Amino acid sequence: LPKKYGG
Amino acid sequence: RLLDELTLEGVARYMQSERCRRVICLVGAGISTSAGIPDFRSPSTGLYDNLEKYHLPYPEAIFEISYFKKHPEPFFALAKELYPGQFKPTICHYFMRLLKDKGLLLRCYTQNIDTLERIAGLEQEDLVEAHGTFYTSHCVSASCRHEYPLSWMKEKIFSEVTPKCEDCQSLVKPDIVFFGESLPARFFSCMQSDFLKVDLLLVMGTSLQVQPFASLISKAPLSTPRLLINKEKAGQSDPFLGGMDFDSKKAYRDVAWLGECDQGCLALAELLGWKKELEDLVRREHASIDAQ
Lengths: 7, 292
Ligand SMILES: *C(=O)C(C)(C)CSCCCCCCCCCCCC
Ligand SMILES: [Zn+2]
What we know:
The PDB classes it as hydrolase. The entry lists the keywords Super-slow substrate, Sirtuin 2, Hydrolase. The complex is a heterodimer. Chain A has no helices and no strands. Chain A is low in regular secondary structure. The termini of chain A are far apart. Chain B is α/β, with parallel strands linked by helices. Classes of the chains: A little secondary structure, B alpha/beta.
């Protein structure tokens, strides 16, 4: 699953 | 078009018609500021400003999972500084409880971690907490994962004792999504099902700037009306990088009510004939919280 990033 | 006019009155009439059965709410920090909860993703809040004494490799390290697991003390020191004095949900939160009571709430997707949706009476099934929540915490060891309630976590934060698991003595972390952690599987699974079923999108207190949450508005069926209740207009295509269309001659389903989220939800409840119900619920729940 996608990881949490700034954007 | 489903709305007879692109106004709050048009949305209220649609909500009262047989066509509007299932509402999805998308909410952000703007629905909790009147509860005293600051916007944690706003540079104006200054989260990254006074971190000198922690000697971090970079300011954002205080919210990154790998750094946290090695050096959790800075995060918990900041959590004590920012911990709210009270958890009293807003008119906006209780408006969503009314939606639930009346069988209209399909789901609330929230970017907030402050637990106010739950206090206001939304249940786990009703919620997609896109960035997790402080409501529960877990031992970080994969083989253990003991769960702890917020009262347990609060006590550790305020006594300045780094929270450790009573079973295995690993760190215990609030269930918010740190940078570098996976976003919740529930966010993607619910999105794939809910937006097949939605009749109205109620977007409140979010500037729709943080992904993937902001892309939820593009998941609505083309006919589904979308109402923004927010201090500022948001969600339109970006003339540079590039969406909501409130104002063009091609606009047909998006409506912006600009003002405080509480006043917008109050105005909508009033049009719906729910104002007394909402006042009575809020005053009762606030009285109950003030009396704890
Ligand atoms: C991702 O964008 C996250 C989830 C990290 C944004 S939250 C960033 C700031 C968190 C500060 C720690 C919380 C302070 C205490 C809040 C208690 C609420 C119940
Ligand atoms: Zn454990």
